[PDB]
Paper text:
Omicron is the most heavily mutated variant to emerge so far, with more than 30 mutations in its spike (S) protein, 15 of which occur in the receptor binding domain ([name]). To delineate the structural basis for antibody-mediated neutralization, we determined the cryo-electron microscopy (cryo-EM) structure of a prefusion-stabilized Omicron S trimer in complex with representative Fab fragments. The two highly potent antibodies against Omicron (XGv347 and XGv289, with IC50 values of 0.006 and 0.016 μg ml−1, respectively), one monoclonal antibody (XGv282 with IC50 of 0.268 μg ml−1) with intermediate neutralizing activities against Omicron, but high neutralizing activities against the other four VOCs, and a monoclonal antibody ([name] with IC50 of 7.479 μg ml−1) with more than 500-fold decreased neutralization against Omicron, but potent neutralization against four other VOCs were selected for structural investigations.
Overall XGv289, XGv282 and [name] bind patches surrounding the right shoulder of [name] with various orientations, but in a manner similar to those observed for LY-CoV1404, BD-812 and REGN10987—antibodies that are known to generally neutralize most VOCs with high potency—but showing decreased, to varying degrees, binding and neutralizing activities against Omicron owing to the presence of new N440K and G446S mutations. Notably, [name] and REGN10987 recognize almost the same epitopes, and both have almost no neutralizing activity against Omicron, despite retaining weak binding. XGv347, XGv289, XGv282 and [name] bound Omicron S with 5- to 40-fold lower affinity compared with their binding to WT S, although the same binding modes were observed for the two orthologues.
Numbering used by the authors:
A (entry chain H): 1 to 119
B (entry chain L): 2 to 6, 8 to 111
C (entry chain E): 330 to 530
Write the structure that this text describes.
Amino acid sequence: QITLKESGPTLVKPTQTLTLTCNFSGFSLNTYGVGVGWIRQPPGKALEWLALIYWDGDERYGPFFKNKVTIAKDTSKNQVVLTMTNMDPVDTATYYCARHLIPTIFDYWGQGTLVTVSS
Amino acid sequence: SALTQPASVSGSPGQSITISCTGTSSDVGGSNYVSWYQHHPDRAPKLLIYEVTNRPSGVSNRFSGSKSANTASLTISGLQAEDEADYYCSSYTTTSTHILFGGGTKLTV
Amino acid sequence: PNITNLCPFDEVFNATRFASVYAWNRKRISNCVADYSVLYNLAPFFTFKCYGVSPTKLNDLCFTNVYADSFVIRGDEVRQIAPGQTGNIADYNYKLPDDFTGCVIAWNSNKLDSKVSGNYNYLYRLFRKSNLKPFERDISTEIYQAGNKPCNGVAGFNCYFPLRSYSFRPTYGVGHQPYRVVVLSFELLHAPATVCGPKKS
């Protein structure tokens, strides 16, 4: 069945670089049209759009975090990887990986995971 | 961001209520592919509106949508305690491909 | 007559990727039994226009051979496919003969070929020295010098790359979405026919 899962840490130091992974089951990213995007939401406010990845190696990042985020795919393992740098205590948020289509912006949202920045 | 939404709207169960999301003429204006999601406390979000007055399979036909000159609005009829959750509006924007809508939590009495 | 094999229309219409306009691919259809009902089965066709024959009487004719040409073009140029028209897509990419006979089909496809901020893998020619004769395909991308001074090496001042790229987003209005176009060509009743519909001989 179509399922989304996330895997990563919970306590990240400010100097460290956050890494996170998402696994999808039910289709392949190689198919023409489907994309995979990442959504973060800091507690007390709304969600946010970080980045998205397409089938043929097209990359679109957030307009304000071009130099900090980096995502990649591995269709042989059905994994997508996200890496971010310069942790700051405001980055405490719950993260989700979701499907992306041109007509419908996001269809299947994952369960996600909450991550905090501290000592 | 340049995109906002009213903080909270509460309505009596069994009566029609509508929650609105607002934007700007430049970023969204008269574009298309507007969307509406609901987020339950500690549960993954699911899609409810993907096109104007359009819903995917597993239909819950009570919910309805509408688009006005610079805003959108989702109407719920026959409220229940299950409807009590957060509601996110969503749309494409020219300056960036983001939504960032605050979302108004639904309340029932 | 004797043969009975369904033609591969679904191998063209239901295809995933359509090539760029300057290098359109031609597919030959022969030795099959035609069926032009599933062609019209799709409702939202933006344009389905036939020049020589009438579409309602396509079920009782024999064709010597069929040719299909498929590509994707902008909406504003979808009217530059009828014979005798001029422009910047019918003069350098795909020109039709004046006595052309056949049917052209075109429909909107913004739901598939578009990207969130634009698609840069679709190309079209913009610079050329002369108009091309009908049904001619060009692939060379040599540095096209414009001014009197000869050019070489890299492009730049008055030295232009003879190609350009599109950009498809779900935010443009009607007239910029990628429209997919398929053109059929065939000749009528002069040779042993290989493509024929159901007959009453």
